[PDB]
Structure 1
Amino acid sequence: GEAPNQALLRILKETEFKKIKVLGSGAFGTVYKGLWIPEGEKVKIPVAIKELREATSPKANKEILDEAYVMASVDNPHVCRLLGICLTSTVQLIMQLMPFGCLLDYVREHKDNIGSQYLLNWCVQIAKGMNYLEDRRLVHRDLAARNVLVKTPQHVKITDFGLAKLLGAEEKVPIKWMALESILHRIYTHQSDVWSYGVTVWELMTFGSKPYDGIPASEISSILEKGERLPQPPICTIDVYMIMVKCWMIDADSRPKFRELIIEFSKMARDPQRYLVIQGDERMHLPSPTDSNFYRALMDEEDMDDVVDADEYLI
């Protein structure tokens, strides 16, 4: 009883885009930072290009095209979407570049300049994107700070949809972010994503700390069974920590819904200093450059007058 998926999959020529630098390296793949120019459209679009290292793994090609399938089928401001794929010897996935990187690295880099208003706003936007995924009956199953990307300090989107799956669908795991029911019984739900959302929030509030640092994963399942949970971050009022605790309840239907988390964090974002206590909160500012020179430096391209962000390139 699911509806037909009429998303369009766009195929791009390798000549249309160029790679500038390597963002990340991995056995499965390499991610580049690039420019994409559509033919005879006179626009330059900053992109991240995802390349798996070799065609040789059957699972691997299945893996990236499943990811392309999911990214092509979502459309939301807090969800990363796919610009297209290139059918090279190895399949390339082309997605919009998020210039400020992943939220985990950003939070660590900028812990000294990050204010309560940004932290609570990121919490709203993540919840919004996750709620959109729930509307689409999509269970992410890998929600984490590392998988949230920063378009601007004001704007973040969810990413890493490779393990994303439909809700009732039959079917190096990260145990620390996982619901207990996921760990014990491979059960995955929107409400198991809510648990992962709690841990992601805890990461942001701890400015990038590692959860259960120094604890072996094999141990983690037992810890949770006892009722141990992640500790209350220093900057966190009991109101915020309590939200985190509700996401980590054993009864999964007991946990909050993403649409509720939007509401609650949004309310808090109206009086941020009442809910997060951060030294010198008022003083702090985070740089948010809109302009063409910022791109020229980032893309190392002399002429960026025709730059257009993916969000403004609509088909």
Structure 2
Amino acid sequence: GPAGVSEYELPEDPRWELPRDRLVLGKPLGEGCFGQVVLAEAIGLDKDKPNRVTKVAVKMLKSDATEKDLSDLISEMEMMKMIGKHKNIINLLGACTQDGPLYVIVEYASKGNLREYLQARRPPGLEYSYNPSHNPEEQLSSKDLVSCAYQVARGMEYLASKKCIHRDLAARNVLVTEDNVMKIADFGLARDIHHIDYYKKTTNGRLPVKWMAPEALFDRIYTHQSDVWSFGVLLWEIFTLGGSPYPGVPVEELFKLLKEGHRMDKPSNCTNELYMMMRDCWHAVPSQRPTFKQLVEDLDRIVALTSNQ
């Protein structure tokens, strides 16, 4: 019977389609752009091991979704296919387009987003703000922190090689897996064709204008060079263990300040070398910023020289 049949033509790709009875839905992972994200166990996700279970994240479409929401979730999924797999991005694993509501299945990152992961690992004392976690975890070593940055840079280098511009690279858009692998999220989202509201917070209270390069702020120009600017902000987030950028600065003053040369001060626990890397990412002139290729090479060297003691 036609009950529950989509009015739309959802694209069935036999390489990726999973019968939804292979998903055992589990705990909520929060509200995404298009609907709930839910942890699930997938049976037989790898057709070579039909009797094994893999934990996955299931992106669903909310019941009151618009046609644009549906189109946007399909577009993200097809973009992930074209971009292909990398260790440091959230990868596509499958989809359910038949016999029920649309699900897009991606890799599960059990430790959640990087900002709250780092906040929960703040040690006491003078160099960081307080630890807000009631389940605090062991502090990371200096090498772990640089390694976090290296992994994100490696993921962005891959995405840039595939001509993918992220446009909102921030610690809240990096997720951390059970094995502490950093994975960039939301890289496949299509760009809004409408102008954005600079003063509208995200559902988690963030103001994305604080990650925008000046040419994105002023003229809405987004390039790989503006993603490098954002990476500089993400570096500052890492070495403040989840800090909020531009403390005390009202957002409507930000472009004026950046234009006059204002940049964030160095975090208390941050080498001169990594601060110089942040500042280079924040070159006013887009052509003068490093590339992700260069950032990867430099972070590789710095990781190797940085103590894990």
User: Could you tell me how far apart the structure 1 residues matched to 2:264 and 2:113 are?
Assistant: 22
Q: Give the C-alpha shift of residue 90 in structure 1.
A: 3.6
Give the Cα–Cα distance (whole angstroms) in 1 for the partners of residues 15 and 234 of structure 2. Answer: 31
| 1:65 aligned to which of 74, 77, 91 | 74
1:252 aligns with 2:252: no
Alignment correspondent of 1:21: 27
Q: Percentage identity across aligned positions?
A: 35
> Which whole-Å CA distance do the structure 1 matches of 2:89 and 2:220 have between them?
25
Letter in 2 for 1:202: W
Quick one: distance in 2 between partners of 1:8 and 1:238?
Answer: 52
Offset of residue 135 of structure 1: 1.0
CA distance, structure 1, for counterparts of residue 35 and residue 228 of structure 2? 29
Distance in 2 between residues matched to 1:158 and 1:221, nearest whole Å? 26
Does the CA contact (< 8 Å) of 1:71 and 1:81 recur in 2? yes
Deviation at 1:183, TM superposition (A): 1.1
Residue 276 of structure 2 is matched in structure 1 by: 242
Check 1:22–1:238 CA distance in 2 against 1; reply closer, same or farther (3 A cut): same
Match of 2:239 in 1: 205
Cα pair distance change 1:193/1:9, threshold 3 Å: farther
Deviations 1:89-115 (A, max 9, x none): 542111111112111111001123111
Match among 160, 163, 186 for residue 160 of structure 1: 186
2:106 paired with 1:76:
no
The Cα of 1:125 is off from its aligned counterpart by 1.0
Contact 2:164 2:187 in 1 (8 A): no
For 2:143 and 2:67, the matched residues in 1 are separated by 45
Matched, 1:175 2:209: yes
Bigger shift: residues 198-207 or 87-96: 87-96
Structure with the greater relative contact order (CA < 8 A, sep ≥ 6): 1 or 2? 1
Q: What is the aligned partner in structure 2 of residue 276 from structure 1?
A: none
Aligned to 1:190: 224
AA aligned opposite 1:122: C
TM-score (normalizing by structure 2):
0.79
TM-score, reference length from structure 1: 0.78
Inter-partner Cα distance in structure 1 for 2:188 and 2:293: 24
Q: Which residue of 1 aligns with 2:110?
A: 99
Is 1:272 matched up with 2:306? yes
- AA in 1 matched with 2:72: E
Alignment correspondent of 1:50:
59
1:124 maps to 2:150: yes
For residue 129 of structure 2, what is the aligned residue in structure 1? none
Residues matched between the structures, number: 263
- Separation in 1, partners of 2:66, 2:190: 20
Given that 1:118 and 1:153 are in contact with CA atoms closer than 8 Å, whether structure 2 keeps it comes out as no
Partner-residue secondary structure (3-state), 2:268: coil
Contact preservation (8 Å) 2:57, 2:106: yes
Cα deviation, residue 52, structure 1: 2.6
Deviation at 1:163, TM superposition (A): 3.1
Contact preservation (8 Å) 1:35, 1:45:
yes
Q: Gapped runs of 5+ residues in structure 2? A: 1-12, 124-138, 192-196, 199-207
After TM superposition, give the deviation of residue 42 of structure 1 in Å: 0.9
- 3-state SS in 2 of match to 1:33: strand
2 CA distance for matches of 1:163 and 1:224? 27
Contact 2:173/2:185 (8 A) holds in 1: yes
Q: Which residue is 1:38 aligned to?
A: 44
CA distance in 2, matches of 1:106, 1:120: 15
In structure 1, the gaps of 5 or more residues are 1-6, 166-171, 274-280, 283-315
Q: CA deviation at 1:56?
A: 3.5
The correspondence for 1:115, drawn from 141, 144, 147, is: 141
Deviations 1:192-231 (Å, cap 9, x if unpaired)? 1001111111101001111123433222221211111112
Q: Equivalents in 1 of 2:282, 2:68: separation in Å?
A: 33
In the alignment, which residue of structure 2 is the partner of 1:215? 249
**Contact 2:165/2:187, CA 8 A, preserved across alignment:** no
Residue identity matched to 2:36: T
**8 Å contact 2:59–2:105 — kept in the other structure?**
yes
